[PDB]
Every structure is written in C-alpha cells, then in structure tokens.
C-alpha cells in the first residue's frame, strides 16, 4: 500500500460499529449518539443522567468488561450551551479494546461522581473541578488539586487568560510572598496562523 | 423523561461572581463580537466563517531594559470563537461583559460575463487582455 | 564603521545611541556597551563586482547547500549592477 | 422562475442564468482556487487555476468564466480536477523565484497557500529559471517582477477601476512582461490598491517593506478619517506600533479599495506629535508641564469669561464625542460660538434639516442613477472612492456625467457644460439643452461639492443647485423615494458637527471676536491672531503640532483616530466608530476626556464619565449618531427649498475652481498627511519626477 | 436666561411621530420665518419616540415627549417652549 | 587544529576572550532600535 | 422548560440562604484561631470585617445554584484555612497589603493613564 498513508483496519471498524449498536440497543434511555472514527475509535455520547448506569454496564457486563478507567477529562467549548464536554476513556483487557464515553454540562449543572464505578476517578474529577469548575455530586473529597491554595478561577477554561490575573514575588517590607496583578515585561505575542484557504474538503460545513 | 427532580429558576444566567475574574476586567471592559474581515492581501475566505469575541485594546509600553512591548492587560490576547452571533452574545451576557455586535458582511453576488469584454457598443469592452 | 556620538558613546551598525539626556546610559557606567565592530554594510561594499557573460546569472551564496536559496539575477539594465537579494554580491554583464 | 438547477458534487443549487461555475460553487460554500479571477474585475481566464471537471464532459472548464448550464454536475474534488490543479501549480512555480524568506508576501501569499492546499509537495523542474528586470512605477509600489505570475489583475484594475491605461503586457510567450514599457510612474489616487490585488510579492508596499510578517500583526478594524467617505480599514499593529493600513470590505462604501492617502499617510502619526501639555513661560515660549498645571491655567481663564468672550473652532479630524463635550462645556458658560473651519451656508433652513447638507442618494445609490450633474467639485481628489463609484456606474450602467466647473480629469469622459456659475441659472430655467436631459432622466442625481460652498456666494450656489433639484424631483420622471439633491463633503468631522448644531465656518468668530479661543484640532489657519484681540487666550487641543499649536497659549495633547474609539459621520450621514489600535503617545489623552477633566477643574462638571455615557449624550442631541453603520434617510427638501428662496443672493462672476486641480494637490491636505514623509515623496515624484 | 436651541427628534415612518411629521410639513417653514436666528434642529431616526428638546442659557435642557401628539399639540408644545424660558 | 586548521575569515576574532561576567567588560543588554515617535519641537520664538 | 434545571444542593433561595448563614458562622468562629495559629498581625476585628466584606459583595445573587457554588467554594476555602494547608501568605492575600490604592475618581485616573 501507499508508503506514506496510514493503512485502514476494516475488521476493527466493523467490530466497533456492531458493539456500538449493541450498547445503544441496551441503554436507549441514555445513549444519544454513537460514532466510530476513521482510525477506529468508538465514542458513545450519552445524556449526563446516564453516567453511573452506562459506566456500570460497561464495567460489569460480560460482553464489555471495561475494568480500567484510562483517563477522565473535560473539554471547554464556549460556543455550546453546555460548554463542558466530559470524556471518559475506558479500557477492556478481556477484549483488548478501548471505548470513549462522552457527556456534557454547564457551569451550574452537577455531574454524578463516578468514584463508585472507578476509584481511579477520584483525582481525575478533582482535576476537572479545579481546572474547569465542573462540580461532581457526592464526591468523597472534592477540592483543588493542582492550583495554588486560594487561587481564583478555573484556568483551563477558554476565557481564562494564559498568564492569569495575578503573579507572585517576595516583598521585603512585609517579609513574605505576596500576590499582585500581572504585568509582563514582554507581552505574549499572539500569532494569526490560520490559512484563509480550506484544507480539508471532507469536513466542510453547510453555509 | 427524567428521574432527577428539577427546580425552576427564572433568574437571568449570571456567573460573574463564580468565575474568579477581578472586578476591573468585568465592568470596565468592552467586548466586540464580529465576523473577522477578509485579509485583503489574499482571496481565501476560510477565515471569515466564524464569529469572534475580542476585548478593547489597552496600553502597551516599552520595557526600559530591552524595549520590549509590556502590558498590564490580562485580556490582551483572549479571542473566543463562536458558531453564531447568538452564541457569542449569550456567552458575553452570562459573563457580565458589555458588548457591541457588528453584523456579518457577506459580499453581494456579482454579475460576471466574459462576453462583455468584447461589447459591440458598450463601455465594458476591454482595450487589452 | 564604529563612529562616536558627542557624548562619547559608540553608535551601533543599526544607528542606535542614547542621546544626551537619556538616563538609560547609566547602565553602561562601570561596564561597557557591547558593539560589534564588523559593519556588514561596509564589508559587503568592499567586494568586487563580478563580470559575467550572460543576461541572467544565478547565486547561491557559495558553498552549495551551505549558502542561501539559489536565485537568478537579471542583468539587462546597464545603468546598475545586479545585486543578490540574499548575500549582497553584485554582478555586471560584460559587453552587452 | 428563471433560476436553473445545477449540482455541485451532487448537491442541487438554484442559480440565475449567466452564473459562472465558480459562482455556483460559492453558493454551497466551496471556494474554487484562482489567481487571475477577481470578482470586481473583468474576467480574464488566463491563469487556469480554476479548472474543474464537469461530470460526463471530457474537458475541464475554466470555472471563473464558464457559464453553468442546466443539469451540470460540477466535481470540485475529482481526481481530474485535482490533477488539473497540480499541473497548473507546477507550471506557476517552475520559473518563480526562491524568494519567500526575503519576499514581503510570505505568510499571506495566495501562491504559497494554494501551493500547500492544491499543489504537489516537491519539484521536478530541473532547468534554470527566468529572471526579469524590475520596473519603477513610483515611490509607493515596489516591483519585483521576477515574482510576477502574469495574472493581469493589475492591468485590469488600472484600466477598469482607476481609469488609467498605463499598465500592459509587452513581449510574447515566456518573455511576456507586465509593465509600462517606457519609464513611467503609475501615480493615481487609487494606485496603492494594486498591491492588494496582486496575488504575489511582485507588487508590494514600498513604505511597508521588510517591517513585519503577517502572522505577527494584530488587526484593529477601524474607519478612515482622511476624507468624508468613511472608508472601512484594518489597522495592522505589532507590539504597540502601527505597521500598515489595509482596506476592509464594505460593499456600500469603499467596496474593497482605499485611496493612497488613506493607505500611506499613517506614517505621519509618528512625526510632529504632541506628547505633553505645554504652557507659555515667562519668556513667552511653550514649555512642558503637567496635566494638573495646564488644565488649571485653562480652567482659570474659562471661569472668568462668558458669552461671546468664549468661542471654539473644530478642525477636520475631530470626533463626535469631543465635539459634543466641547459644545456642552461652552454652553455652560452660555457660549454658542461653536464653529467649524469648513463653511456651509446658513441661509434658509441651514442645518435645521439634515437633507440640506447630506449626500441623500447615498454612495451605493450612484449605481442606480442614470444622469449625474457634478457642480464645483473634483470628486477624484475630494472623495476618490466616491469617484471610483461613479466610474463603475459609467462603465457598467452607461451613466451620463456632466460637470460645471474646471475641466478636471475624472478618469472617465464626461460632458463639460462650462465653469461659470450662471449655467446653473440656464439649467433651472430650461434654456440650457442639458436641462432636457435632466427632465428625461428617471433617476437624476445632482452633486454639489462642499468645496464650492467655501466661496463667499455659497448660499447663492446652493440655492441655484437646489432650485434645479426641486424643479426635477417634484415632477414626472422620478419616483417619490428617489432623492436628487446631494452634498459631497470632504472633511471627516463636518457632518457630525452639523448634526450637533455647530455653526459652519468662522464668520461668527469674526463678527464677535472672543477673548478665549479653543482650537480643537483646528489647523486650517482660518482664524489667526491677526483676527483676534491682542490678549486672546488660545487653547490648542490636538495630536500634531502644525498650524494651530504654534500660536497657542496652552497645548493639550489629544489622541489620533488610531488611538481612540470615536464616532465619525461620513458624507452620507452614516455614523461609524473607530477602535483603539494603539494608545496615545506620552501624556496624550482621549480628546473628550480632556474636556471632561477641564470641566471638573472649572467647576462645571459635565454629566458623563465613561465613553458609553458621552455616547448616550450624543443620542440626546442627534439620535442617528449612535446608529452605527446605518444610513438614516432625511426628508423635507420642499421645506428647505421654500426657505432657500426667501432671500435672493447674487452669484459671483468668478468661475468655479476646485481647490485640487492635479494629483500634486491630493497628497497633503491635513495635519497627518502634511507630516507624512511618504506623502512628501509622492509630491516630489509627481512634481520633479522619477529621477 | 433665554432659549438657545430647539431640537425635534422623530421617526420617518412610525405612527407615533405622525403629528410631528405633519407639523414639519405644514408649519415648520412658518416657524422658521418668525425665528430666523433660532436653531431648530430636526433630526429623524428610525424607531425613536418623538421628543422636543429645549436648550436654555448655561446649558440647561428640557425635553417634552411628543409621542402620539397631533400637529396642533406639537404647535402648543413649541409655543410654551418659545414663550416660557428656563 | 595543528593538523586541520580552521578556515580563515577577516571577521573572526584573532584574540579569544574568556567569560567576562562579573567584570567591567561584562555584557549589558540594551535596545538596538531607534526612537519610533518623534515629538513636536515648539518654536524657539514668542508668538508676538 | 429551559428554566427547569437540576439543583446543586438548594431547591430555592430560602434553602440556599440557610447554608450561607451556616458558612458565615463557621468563618466567624474560625477567625480567632486563624489569627493565633498563623500568628497574623491583624486583629480579630479586622479578620471578621474582611469576612463580612466577602459575604456582602455577593449579596445581590438570586440564583440558588449560583449561591450553592459560592457556599461550596467558601467551604473549601475554610477547610484550607482550618487544616493549615494554607500558609500565612495565602491568608494575608485577602488584604492586599503591598498594593497601592488605585485612584477611583475621574480626574485621578485621567492624570495617571488611559484606563477608565
Ligand atoms: S510571491 Fe509568494 S511564493 Fe513567491 S517568493 Fe513571495 S511569498 Fe514565496
Ligand atoms: S504584477 Fe501581480 S497583479 Fe500584475 S500581472 Fe503580475 S502577478 Fe498579476
Ligand atoms: S481564475 Fe479562472 S483562469 Fe484564472
Ligand atoms: K502583492
Ligand atoms: Zn547570493
């Protein structure tokens, strides 16, 4: 085949598609959309009420057995009404397969903690709360994990500035480290890099 | 539908108090919601598809040591992308930013005729090719 | 080359020099103003013009792939030399 | 029902007859690659980059020129189309020079970008390349013609848009060259636009050369103040400095063009700038001081004078926010002598009715007119983008143009009726034969230049022109909604001042000389110290030290149009606002904030502390001033004509002579352009020569 | 202490400005004759409630809403402004 | 270099220098560009 | 409808207000220990006035879910203080001791710069 072109795997594509329909048939109450990517990754998009039921089924069902929570993160998309996309990446050692489960939320809508299903989720959900400000209901110990104590804001939101709002220095008069509004000797230089010509016709959107 | 018992909230959605933004950069800022103009140096139109939100420009000054451009504006580089004008307005309102909206400027359809270059009795006849 | 201002400060090849009342020259007291003394504008001017026997000549700066992108220089005008946009070498058509 | 059905990759689209294949693809959001095609130029069809496969047709067609036929399926992504693009891109790059690192187009080059998206990734061209001599066409446009791809856009622009036929092709085949053949400078008020349309680095801005790369610039969308057209622009800045001015498309104003003064005079913003407040010392010399001290001196004088003892003149670049602030301040000492340098007759309605001083037909309405009468104006230099609109209609709508005044070169042929103003009497009465053409016309348009109203008999001329307009409009021929009478302004601040109730001209100040004079950017020199009492206290507020500043007692450094968010109303009455691109230099301040600060020191605090509040104030004086990008129609031409006929004034004998007769008078007309070193080179080029 | 300026704001099409429009078409010319040196700024803008602004000495301003006024009510509103100072 | 000497150039230092930090020969940074905005200079004579 | 939303903890403002008052009491009683434990140079009165100032600035909220998140964040802040996860620098960051007072009147801002 073409030496520079990634080869397609049509068997895995068909297997993942069939299992995606399988999941959607069993949990119609929650599954909103199922898709398989051209590089063979299965995504299950669900209503946020289905977090615990869907994850529990995927972990415990005999034909699923997704015992490992590889990763749990969020994505901020300000143009959406529910700006926060919550992404669960699961691994099945029994069937040597991965699956992605996605749901959504806004700044004020809690999501149910998945710690009951995966104890791995404990710190991942603290990170989502810290970095995105998404609240997780019934989390055993929800608090910041990566930011400074007393830090204000959620810095992975698309509208949080790259350099933040405050900066630190040691002040000799008060004999301690103090926080002050950020000033930069050199402002970060924004580059406009996007070409004005379309690159990928296959992804064109209706006018 | 749901087994989760919902509540009714008629309040206008406002999240200023829970975003951590300093008071200065909510009330004294002006957000501009617009579709970027085409860069006239090129004919490609692919950078005129989405709505953008930017903020009012503030002072930049020269660093005494090197002459670099310094700033005290934390929002000087923040540019948000939106699918529609309504999405951009909704985002600005709930964040408490004052804003202006500029309507999209679509080029108007033109009447193009190659044959017009060779008119028998009209001024569109070209003197050269 | 390196000239000096009335205050005694050296002028860089970019023309920079603090004027009389600029406090910023205090940074040089007890230290020095780093200035590069090989002005490229003077050095390239010392080079002689190459006489060639064609209307178009190409320059890659010498050394092959260690030079600059290869460009072709038109030599039709006889009122000036053809200069390389990359390295500044000059060419002139002999006879024609 | 005339629309036909065609398909773009199988998706149905309904298009009107005559639509090209390229335009059909636009409707479904697909942009065909192009080089020679430009939607505002005549079709050329020579680059062949737009070639596309029609389903079942063995030969590819030039999408930019081929009319689409019913039932055609356009395959914009088939192997046949993609191979055509790769082949054409290969030919374009064979002789192109390896110049991207040293070429200013790099980073915003259609050849670079379309090579990436539609070309191959490597070369199989193993020969030597063509090299071409450079052509000198003036001090604004640099030429590196080895980069030219012979798209002929510049030739078609110069011929069709600019009305100049100096650019052509010489030679044949691979040695075909774009240029002027002889040594000639392409000096036109629209010349700089050939930089934008040229898809490659062959034509570039000489003032801009080597200073920046496109990705590193920040774009501030703003408005031009070099004339009263109100051209939309993008101000490119980098690390707090203005780098260049580019056009910003506005179909109803400047389309995608700007004048050379708009494009290149920005370098005047870096010279002769007022950066600190200044007062006169004991030796009578201006010396720097603090804002506290300068305002206290001004506030002390303002508190001791009232009524006609206080007056203000507003120059041509003042914004509406500053104008209203100064008017409110002077009103609080019960002074109404708020004047502008640009005269507009106050006889009859005067400024009571907006229709009396606006371009009522609007700029875009020129394309619907079938006759235009130009009176006492050189629109080519007073409003270059408005003159380009007239040429566009002359070209495509076969518009008939007549001129009363000096016979200037408008770039299109017109009918010269003479220069005496008495011809206006003949046309009104019906004696003149051109009177019949106006009566025939379905949509006549009569344009009177603001420059012609600077004559001492301006009221007579305006009455004469209004008489012609009203005899036509209220009669068979023109619909009720078509507006005939138009004023063409040349000063960016004039219409806003008139909307706000300023007195046009300085006659009021001459009648009752004041003891305290505010010069708000007033650099025309209409009022000098020889026209004022010996002890007149003059306060100059502005951004350039030029004419007003040398004679002032206090200088208050204001901001330029690139350094503030300010409202300007163009010649049509359309309100538009600039945006801050860079903050003002040194200690300079936003102009309305200076007046607001002054009022607080003087104990007459104005009731607005923010920009939004002073704009709410603008709405209370003239509501249209905050309706941005909207043209508000003005009526009551009959009422204006009734008041105009009440006092009969006699025209003067001297013929109408525009202040600008040749291009040399175009470049320097205000403080910014007079400080521009680029504009100075332009004057030298057109006067002395290329040498 | 007297009147300094008059401004009349109105819409070009709204029925709430119909009376103000009638006043201009019928009576403005006569009003301007009697008051040759008084600024009477007529400013039309779409979708505004009609108003009469009167500016007196030293920057004091009064506004009177003219919404749904007849041409005769507008006349009397202007008469009060012209007669009574403030 | 006694066997393969470096290529000679007119601009190469003939006198190598060691680390000058902490001495009067130390490098001191500064902006190499010229002033960007020229300020207006008032006339040196009284108005009248 | 779109106004039918999922609550966090409180189903209405009266339930939310109870949580606010409980948080305020916890902070009010913590200040004396914080001043002693972190050996601060502020008085207990200064600390408690700072607590009151922080609660007042959010007095205008009428959305129970927003109030819920304010209380959730306020309780996290309290836990950081009580457990001594914060250091003295973090506690003193509420008082901005090294920041000079920025001017607030129009004239004072006019003299110093361009910002409103
Ligand atoms: S015109 Fe474009 S492709 Fe040609 S040298 Fe310049 S940047 Fe490169
Ligand atoms: S100079 Fe530019 S616009 Fe003119 S023909 Fe060449 S590539 Fe086209
Ligand atoms: S764009 Fe059609 S041939 Fe050039
Ligand atoms: K170009
Ligand atoms: Zn070279």
């Amino acid at each position: 085949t073409r030496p520079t072109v990634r080869p397609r795997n049509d068997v895995a594509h068909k297997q993942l598609s069939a299992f995606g329909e399988y999941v959607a048939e069993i949990l119609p109450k929650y599954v909103q959309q199922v898709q398989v990517s051209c590089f063979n990754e299965l995504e299950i998009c669900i209503h946020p009420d289905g977090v615990i039921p869907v994850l529990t089924f995927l972990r415990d069902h005999s034909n699923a057995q997704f015992k490992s929570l590889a990763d749990l993160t969020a994505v901020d998309i300000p143009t959406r009404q529910n700006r926060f996309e919550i992404v669960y990446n699961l691994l099945s050692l029994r069937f040597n397969s991965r699956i992605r489960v996605k749901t959504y939320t806004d700044e004020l809508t809690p999501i149910e903690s998945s710690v009951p299903v995966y104890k791995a989720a404990n710190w991942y959900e603290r990170e989502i709360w810290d970095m995105f400000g998404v609240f997780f209901a019934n989390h055993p110990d929800l608090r910041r994990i990566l930011t400074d104590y007393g830090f204000e804001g959620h810095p992975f939101r698309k509208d949080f500035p790259l350099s933040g709002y405050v900066e630190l220095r040691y002040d000799d008069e008060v004999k301690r480290v103090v926080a002050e509004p950020v000033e930069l000797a050199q402002e970060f230089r924004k580059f406009d890099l996007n070409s004005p010509w379309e690159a990928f016709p296959a992804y064109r959107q209706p006018p | 539908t749901r087994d989760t018992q919902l509540i009714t909230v008629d309040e206008k959605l406002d999240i200023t108090t829970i975003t951590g933004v300093p008071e200065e950069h909510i009330k004294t800022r002006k957000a501009r919601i617009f579709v970027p103009a085409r860069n006239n140096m090129q004919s490609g139109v692919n950078n005129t598809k989405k709505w953008k939100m930017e903020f009012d420009t503030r002072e930049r000054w020269e660093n005494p040591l090197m002459g670099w451009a310094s700033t005290a504006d934390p929002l000087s580089n923040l540019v948000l992308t939106f699918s529609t004008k309504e999405d951009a307005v909704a985002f600005a309102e709930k964040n408490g930013w004052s804003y202006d909206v500029e309507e999209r400027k679509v080029p108007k359809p033109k009447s193009k005729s190659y044959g017009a270059n060779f008119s028998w009795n009209k001024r569109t006849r070209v003197s050269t090719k | 080359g390196v000239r000096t201002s009335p205050t005694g400060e050296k002028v860089t090849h970019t023309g920079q020099v603090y004027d009389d009342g600029d406090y910023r020259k205090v940074r040089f007291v007890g230290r020095q103003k780093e200035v590069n003394e090989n002005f490229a504008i003077d050095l390239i001017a010392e080079q002689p013009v190459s006489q060639v026997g064609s209307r178009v000549i190409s320059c890659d700066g010498g050394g092959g792939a260690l030079g600059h992108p290869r460009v072709y220089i038109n030599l039709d005008k006889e009122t000036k030399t053809g200069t390389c946009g990359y390295c500044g070498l000059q060419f002139r058509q002999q006879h024609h | 029902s005339n629309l036909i059905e065609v398909f773009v990759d199988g998706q149905s689209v309904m298009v009107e007859p005559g639509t090209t294949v390229l335009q059909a693809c636009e409707k479904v959001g697909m942009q065909i690659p192009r080089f020679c095609y430009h939607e505002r130029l005549s079709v050329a069809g020579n680059c062949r980059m737009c070639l596309v496969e029609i389903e079942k047709a063995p030969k590819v067609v030039a999408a930019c020129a081929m009319p689409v036929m019913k039932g055609w399926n356009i395959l914009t992504n088939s192997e046949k189309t993609k191979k055509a693009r790769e082949g054409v891109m290969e030919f374009l790059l064979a002789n192109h020079p390896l110049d991207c690192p040293i070429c200013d187009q790099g980073g915003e080059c259609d050849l670079q970008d379309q090579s990436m998206m539609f070309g191959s990734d490597r070369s199989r061209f193993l020969e030597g390349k063509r090299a071409v001599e450079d052509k000198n066409i003036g001090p604004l446009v640099k030429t590196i013609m080895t980069r030219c791809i012979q798209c002929t856009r510049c030739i078609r622009f110069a011929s069709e848009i600019a009305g100049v036929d100096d650019l052509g092709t010489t030679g044949r085949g691979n040695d075909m060259q774009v240029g002027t053949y002889i040594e000639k400078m392409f000096m036109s008020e629209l010349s700089g636009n050939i930089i934008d349309i040229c898809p490659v680095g062959a034509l570039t801005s000489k003032p801009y050369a080597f200073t920046a790369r496109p990705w590193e610039t920040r774009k501030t969308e703003s408005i031009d103040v070099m004339d009263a057209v109100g051209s939309n622009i993008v101000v490119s800045t980098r690390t707090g400095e203005v780098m260049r001015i580019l056009p910003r498309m506005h179909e109803d104003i400047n389309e995608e063009w700007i004048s050379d003064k708009t494009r290149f005079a920005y370098d005047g913003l870096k010279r002769q700038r007022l950066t600190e407040p200044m007062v006169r010392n004991e030796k009578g010399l201006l010396t720097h001081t603090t804002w506290e001290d300068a305002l206290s001196r001004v506030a002390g004088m303002l508190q001791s004078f009232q009524g006609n003892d206080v007056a203000a003149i507003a120059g041509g670049l003042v914004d509406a926010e500053a104008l209203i602030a100064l008017k409110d301040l002077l009103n609080r000492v019960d002074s109404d002598t708020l004047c502008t340098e640009e005269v507009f007759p106050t006889a009859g309605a005067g400024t009571d009715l907006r229709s009396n001083y606006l371009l009522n037909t609007t700029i875009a309405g020129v394309e619907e007119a079938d006759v235009v009468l130009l009176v006492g104006t050189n629109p080519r230099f007073e409003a270059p983008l408005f003159n380009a609109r007239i040429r566009k209609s002359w070209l495509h709508n076969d518009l008939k143009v007549a001129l009363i005044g000096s016979p200037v070169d408008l770039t299109y042929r017109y009918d010269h009726l003479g220069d005496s103003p008495k011809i206006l009497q003949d046309i009104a009465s019906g004696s003149h034969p051109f009177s019949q053409v106006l009566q025939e016309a379905k949509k006549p348009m009569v344009i009177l230049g603001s420059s012609a109203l600077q004559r001492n008999d301006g009221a007579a001329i305006l009455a004469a022109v209004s008489n012609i307009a009203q005899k036509i409009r209220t009669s068979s021929g023109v619909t009720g909604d078509w507006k005939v009478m138009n004023i063409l302004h040349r000063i960016a601040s004039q219409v806003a001042a008139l909307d706000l109730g300023y007195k046009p001209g300085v006659e009021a100040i001459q009648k009752n000389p004041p003891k305290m004079l505010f010069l708000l950017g007033a650099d025309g020199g209409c009022i000098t110290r020889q026209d004022l009492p010996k002890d007149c206290f003059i306060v100059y507020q502005g951004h350039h030290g030029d004419v007003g500043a040398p004679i002032a007692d206090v200088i208050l450094p204001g901001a330029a149009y690139t350094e503030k968010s300010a409202t300007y109303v163009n010649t049509e009455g359309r309100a538009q606002q600039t945006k801050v691109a860079v903050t003002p230099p040194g200690l300079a301040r936003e102009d309305w904030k200076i007046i607001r600060a002054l009022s607080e020191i003087a104990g007459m605090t104005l009731p607005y502390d923010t920009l939004d509040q002073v704009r709410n104030r603008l709405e209370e004086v003239s509501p249209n001033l905050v309706r941005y990008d909207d043209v508000e129609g003005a009526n009551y031409f009959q009422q204006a004509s009734e008041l105009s006929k009440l006092v009969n004034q006699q025209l003067l004998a001297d013929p109408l002579v525009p202040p600008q007769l040749t291009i040399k008078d175009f470049y320097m007309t205000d403080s910014i352009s007079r400080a521009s070193q680029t504009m100075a080179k332009c004057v030298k080029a057109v006067t002395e020569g290329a040498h | 202490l007297g009147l300094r300026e008059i401004r009349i704001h109105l819409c070009q099409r709204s029925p709430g400005s119909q009376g103000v429009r009638d006043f201009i078409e019928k009576r403005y010319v006569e009003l301007k004759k009697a008051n040759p040196d008084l600024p009477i700024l007529i400013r039309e803008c779409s979708d505004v409630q009609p108003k009469l602004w009167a500016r007196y000495a030293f920057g004091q301003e009064k506004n009177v809403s003219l919404n749904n006024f007849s041409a005769d009510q507008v006349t009397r509103a202007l008469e009060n402004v012209l007669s009574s100072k403030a | 270099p006694t066997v393969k000497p470096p290529t000679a150039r007119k601009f190469i230092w003939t006198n190598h220098k060691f680390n000058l930090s902490g001495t009067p020969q130390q490098y001191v940074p500064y902006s190499t560009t010229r002033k960007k905005i020229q300020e207006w200079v008032p006339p040196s004579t009284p108005y009248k | 409808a779109s106004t039918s939303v999922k609550p966090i903890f409180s189903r209405d403002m009266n339930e939310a207000k109870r949580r606010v008052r409980e948080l305020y009491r916890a902070w009010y009683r913590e200040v004396p220990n914080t001043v002693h434990l972190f050996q601060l140079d502020i008085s207990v009165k200064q600390g408690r006035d700072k607590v009151r100032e922080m609660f007042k600035k959010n007095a205008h909220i009428t959305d129970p879910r927003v109030v819920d998140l304010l209380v959730i964040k306020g309780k996290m802040e309290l836990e950081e203080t009580i457990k001594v996860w914060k250091q003295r620098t973090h506690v003193m960051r509420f008082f901005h001791e090294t920041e000079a007072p920025r001017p607030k009147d129009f004239l004072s801002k006019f003299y110093v710069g361009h910002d409103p």
Side-chain angles (χ1 to χ4, degrees), chain A residues 81 106-112 129 135 141-144 148-150 154 168-169 171 174 176-181, chain G residues 2 6-9 57 63 65-66 69 72-73 76-77 79-80 85-90 92-93 96-99:
Chain A
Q81 180 188 332
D106 58 51
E107 299 90 323
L108 300 178
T109 302
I111 293 283
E112 190 58 37
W129 160 256
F135 184 71
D141 174 36
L142 197 70
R143 52 189 174 95
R144 77 177 70 262
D148 197 6
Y149 304 109
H154 304 287
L168 297 195
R169 70 184 181 78
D171 187 87
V174 294
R176 66 171 184 269
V177 176
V178 304
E180 308 181 294
Chain G
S2 187
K6 190 189 176 189
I8 304 181
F9 287 121
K57 87 189 210 200
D63 180 348
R65 296 190 300 170
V66 170
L69 271 165
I72 288 163
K73 290 185 158 199
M76 295 172 180
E77 205 80 271
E79 178 182 45
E80 291 181 349
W85 298 340
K86 288 182 179 291
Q87 293 108 74
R88 172 155 67 260
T89 182
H90 299 96
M92 291 311 305
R93 274 170 214 184
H96 311 273
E97 298 203 328
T98 57
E99 283 172 42

Side-chain angles (χ1 to χ4, degrees), chain C residues 86, chain D residues 93 96-113 115 144 146-149 198-202 204 213:
Chain C
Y86 279 101
Chain D
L93 293 186
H96 196 73
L98 272 70
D99 274 358
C100 301
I102 61 174
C103 168
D104 277 332
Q105 204 71 24
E108 59 186 1
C109 177
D110 270 350
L111 190 55
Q112 279 188 332
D113 284 353
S115 166
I144 308 290
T146 302
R147 306 169 184 164
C148 174
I149 58 170
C198 178
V200 289
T204 58
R213 282 293 185 193

Side-chain angles (χ1 to χ4, degrees), chain D residues 423-445:
Chain D
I423 289 134
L424 291 167
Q425 314 279 47
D426 300 6
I427 291 170
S429 88
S431 182
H432 208 284
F434 186 78
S435 66
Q436 201 60 23
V437 169
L438 291 178
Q439 278 265 130
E440 295 268 347
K442 304 290 200 302
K443 289 181 160 186
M445 181 175 186

Side-chain angles (χ1 to χ4, degrees), chain C residues 59-61 68 71 84-89 91:
Chain C
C59 183
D60 65 6
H68 58 68
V71 288
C84 174
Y86 279 101
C87 70
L89 291 177
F91 312 82

